[PDB]
Design an enzyme around this catalytic site. Structure first.
Site, PDB file in Angstrom:
ATOM      1  N   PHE A  23       0.790  -1.071   0.210  1.00  0.00           N
ATOM      2  CA  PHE A  23       0.222   0.127  -0.117  1.00  0.00           C
ATOM      3  C   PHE A  23       0.708   1.407   0.152  1.00  0.00           C
ATOM      4  CE2 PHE A  23      -4.150  -1.744  -0.038  1.00  0.00           C
ATOM      5  CZ  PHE A  23      -4.121  -2.886   0.616  1.00  0.00           C
ATOM      6  N   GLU A  88       6.593  -4.117  14.900  1.00  0.00           N
ATOM      7  CA  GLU A  88       8.139  -4.082  15.475  1.00  0.00           C
ATOM      8  C   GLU A  88       8.841  -3.884  14.347  1.00  0.00           C
ATOM      9  OE1 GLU A  88       7.740  -8.845  16.490  1.00  0.00           O
ATOM     10  OE2 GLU A  88       9.731  -8.110  16.053  1.00  0.00           O
ATOM     11  N   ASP A 134      -2.673 -13.153  -0.014  1.00  0.00           N
ATOM     12  CA  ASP A 134      -1.873 -12.293  -0.623  1.00  0.00           C
ATOM     13  C   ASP A 134      -0.353 -12.849  -0.878  1.00  0.00           C
ATOM     14  OD1 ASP A 134      -1.318  -8.630  -0.453  1.00  0.00           O
ATOM     15  OD2 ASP A 134      -1.256 -10.223  -1.988  1.00  0.00           O
ATOM     16  N   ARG A 138       4.047 -12.003   0.482  1.00  0.00           N
ATOM     17  CA  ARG A 138       4.900 -12.983   1.663  1.00  0.00           C
ATOM     18  C   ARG A 138       6.200 -12.514   1.378  1.00  0.00           C
ATOM     19  NH1 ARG A 138       1.654 -18.952   0.662  1.00  0.00           N
ATOM     20  NH2 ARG A 138      -0.340 -18.133   0.961  1.00  0.00           N
ATOM     21  N   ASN A 139       6.813 -12.484   2.701  1.00  0.00           N
ATOM     22  CA  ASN A 139       8.402 -12.124   2.795  1.00  0.00           C
ATOM     23  C   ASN A 139       8.784 -12.742   4.170  1.00  0.00           C
ATOM     24  OD1 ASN A 139      10.899 -11.177   1.832  1.00  0.00           O
ATOM     25  ND2 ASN A 139      10.610  -9.337   2.607  1.00  0.00           N
ATOM     26  N   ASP A 152       4.503  -9.226   5.606  1.00  0.00           N
ATOM     27  CA  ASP A 152       3.969  -8.878   4.146  1.00  0.00           C
ATOM     28  C   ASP A 152       4.370  -7.609   3.758  1.00  0.00           C
ATOM     29  OD1 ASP A 152       2.550  -7.388   6.152  1.00  0.00           O
ATOM     30  OD2 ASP A 152       0.580  -8.261   5.684  1.00  0.00           O
TER      31      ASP A 152
HETATM   32  C1  LIG Z   1       0.740 -11.454   9.808  1.00  0.00           C
HETATM   33  C2  LIG Z   1       0.259 -11.665   8.324  1.00  0.00           C
HETATM   34  C3  LIG Z   1       1.170 -12.473   7.584  1.00  0.00           C
HETATM   35  C4  LIG Z   1       1.877 -11.919   6.408  1.00  0.00           C
HETATM   36  C5  LIG Z   1       2.747 -12.674   5.871  1.00  0.00           C
HETATM   37  C6  LIG Z   1       2.965 -14.083   6.136  1.00  0.00           C
HETATM   38  C7  LIG Z   1       3.659 -15.083   5.211  1.00  0.00           C
HETATM   39  C8  LIG Z   1       4.984 -14.485   4.997  1.00  0.00           C
HETATM   40  C9  LIG Z   1       5.964 -15.334   4.352  1.00  0.00           C
HETATM   41  C10 LIG Z   1       5.495 -16.426   3.897  1.00  0.00           C
HETATM   42  C11 LIG Z   1       4.364 -17.019   4.369  1.00  0.00           C
HETATM   43  C12 LIG Z   1       3.694 -16.264   4.904  1.00  0.00           C
HETATM   44  C13 LIG Z   1       3.766 -18.374   3.744  1.00  0.00           C
HETATM   45  C14 LIG Z   1       4.757 -19.522   3.420  1.00  0.00           C
HETATM   46  C15 LIG Z   1       4.042 -20.536   3.042  1.00  0.00           C
HETATM   47  N1  LIG Z   1       2.898 -20.418   3.475  1.00  0.00           N
HETATM   48  N2  LIG Z   1       2.767 -19.020   3.769  1.00  0.00           N
HETATM   49  C16 LIG Z   1       1.442 -18.349   4.458  1.00  0.00           C
HETATM   50  C17 LIG Z   1       0.958 -18.565   5.856  1.00  0.00           C
HETATM   51  S1  LIG Z   1       6.403 -19.010   3.151  1.00  0.00           S
HETATM   52  O1  LIG Z   1       6.773 -19.327   1.736  1.00  0.00           O
HETATM   53  O2  LIG Z   1       7.201 -19.177   4.404  1.00  0.00           O
HETATM   54  N3  LIG Z   1       6.428 -17.445   2.899  1.00  0.00           N
HETATM   55  C18 LIG Z   1       7.511 -16.659   2.054  1.00  0.00           C
HETATM   56  C19 LIG Z   1       2.164 -14.786   6.987  1.00  0.00           C
HETATM   57  C20 LIG Z   1       1.190 -13.944   7.956  1.00  0.00           C
END
Ligand SMILES: CCc1ccc(-c2ccc3c(c2)-c2c(cnn2CC)S(=O)(=O)N3C)cc1
Length: 259
Positions: A23, A88, A134, A138-139, A152
Site C-alpha cells: 500500500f 515491530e 496475498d 509474503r516475505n 507482508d
Molecule cells: C501477519 C500476516 C502474515 C503475513 C505474511 C505471512 C507470510 C510470509 C511469508 C511466507 C508465508 C506467509 C507463507 C509461506 C508458506 N505459506 N505461507 C502463508 C502462511 S512462506 O513461503 O514461508 N512465506 C514466504 C504470514 C502472515
C-alpha cells in the site's frame, strides 16, 4: 474495532524510509510509549479513496489476531488520516539480502534454525486456520542473528515459488503453502539465491510436470533435502503437514548442533 491499540501520533517520530509494502512506503520510527522504541511504520499512498483505506487497515486487523515469536508483531495503528500501521522493527532487514551479504559468516545450524523457526510459525497459522491470500506480499525478515519472522512487506504472482495446482487451477490450500515453504527452505540453504534463475516463468510449469526439481544445495544435509523434495510432491495430498515439518526440522537441527 481498533480502539484498544490506537496510538497517538505525537508519540511516534517518523524517520527514514526503509522499504515498501503493498500500500505504500515503510518507514523506521521511534515510538515513545515502556521506552522510546524503534518501530516500522506502514504508510499508505492513495488512502484518500475509501476502498484502499479499508483494505490497508484490514492488514492491521489481521496481524492483530496473531501472537508468535516468528511473525511480525503489530504494536498499533493510527486510524485518522494519514493512516499508519506501527509494527515491530526487524533491524537486520530482509532474509534474502541478509543471507547474501552473510554468505561466509552464517553456519549451517543458523540456516536450519531459520527454516525450523518459520515452520513453527506456519504451523501456528495452520492451527489458527488462517488462509493467507496475498501470496505476492509474503516475505521473511530478520529481527536478529538467531531470529527470523514472517511479514507482508519488504525492507504479479510468484510463479516460481508456486505449487502446480496453484498455477493451473488457482487452487490455494495448506498444501500449496507447504510447496512454497519447500522453495523458501531451498532458498535459505542456497544463501538467498532465487529459484529458477534464467528460466522463463511459462517454461517453469512444464519442467515441474517433467519431474524436475531444484537440486540439492551445496552443503545441504541429505535429511533436509529429502524433506524439501517431499514438499514438492505433485499430488498435493502426498506433501507433509507443517506440523510434520516442524518436528522433522527439529531433529535435523539437533543433528547439526551436535556436530
Ligand atoms: C501477519 C500476516 C502474515 C503475513 C505474511 C505471512 C507470510 C510470509 C511469508 C511466507 C508465508 C506467509 C507463507 C509461506 C508458506 N505459506 N505461507 C502463508 C502462511 S512462506 O513461503 O514461508 N512465506 C514466504 C504470514 C502472515
Amino acid at each position: 474495532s481498533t480502539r484498544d491499540y490506537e496510538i497517538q501520533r505525537e508519540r511516534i517520530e517518523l524517520g527514514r524510509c526503509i522499504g515498501e509494502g503493498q500500500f505504500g512506503d515503510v518507514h523506521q520510527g521511534i515510538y515513545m510509549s515502556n521506552p522510546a522504541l524503534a518501530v516500522a511504520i506502514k504508510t499508505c499512498k492513495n488512502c484518500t479513496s475509501d476502498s484502499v483505506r479499508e483494505k490497508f487497515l484490514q492488514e492491521a486487523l489481521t496481524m492483530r489476531q496473531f501472537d508468535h515469536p516468528h511473525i511480525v508483531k503489530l504494536i498499533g495503528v493510527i486510524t485518522e488520516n494519514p493512516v499508519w500501521i506501527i509494527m515491530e522493527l526487524c533491524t537486520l532487514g530482509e532474509l534474502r539480502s541478509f543471507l547474501q551479504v552473510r554468505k561466509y559468516s552464517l553456519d549451517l545450524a543458523s540456516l536450519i534454525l531459520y527454516a525450523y523457526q518459520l515452520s513453527t510459525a506456519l504451523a501456528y497459522l495452520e492451527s489458527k486456520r488462517f488462509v493467507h491470500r496475498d501470496i505476492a506480499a509474503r516475505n521473511v525478515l530478520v529481527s536478529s542473528n538467531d531470529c527470523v519472522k514472517l511479514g507482508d512487506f519488504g525492507l504479479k504472482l510468484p510463479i516460481k515459488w508456486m505449487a502446480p495446482e496453484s498455477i493451473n487451477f488457482r487452487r490455494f490450500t495448506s498444501a500449496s503453502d507447504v510447496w512454497m515453504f519447500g522453495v523458501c527452505m531451498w532458498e535459505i540453504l542456497m544463501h538467498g539465491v532465487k529459484p529458477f534463475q534464467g528460466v522463463k516463468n511459462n517454461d517453469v510449469i512444464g519442467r515441474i510436470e517433467n519431474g524436475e526439481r531444484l537440486p540439492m544445495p551445496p552443503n545441504c544435509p541429505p535429511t533436509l533435502y529429502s524433506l524439501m523434495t517431499k514438499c514438492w510432491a505433485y499430488d498435493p495430498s502426498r506433501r507433509p503437514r507443517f506440523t510434520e515439518l516442524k518436528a522433522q526440522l527439529s531433529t535435523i537441527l539437533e543433528e547439526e548442533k551436535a556436530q
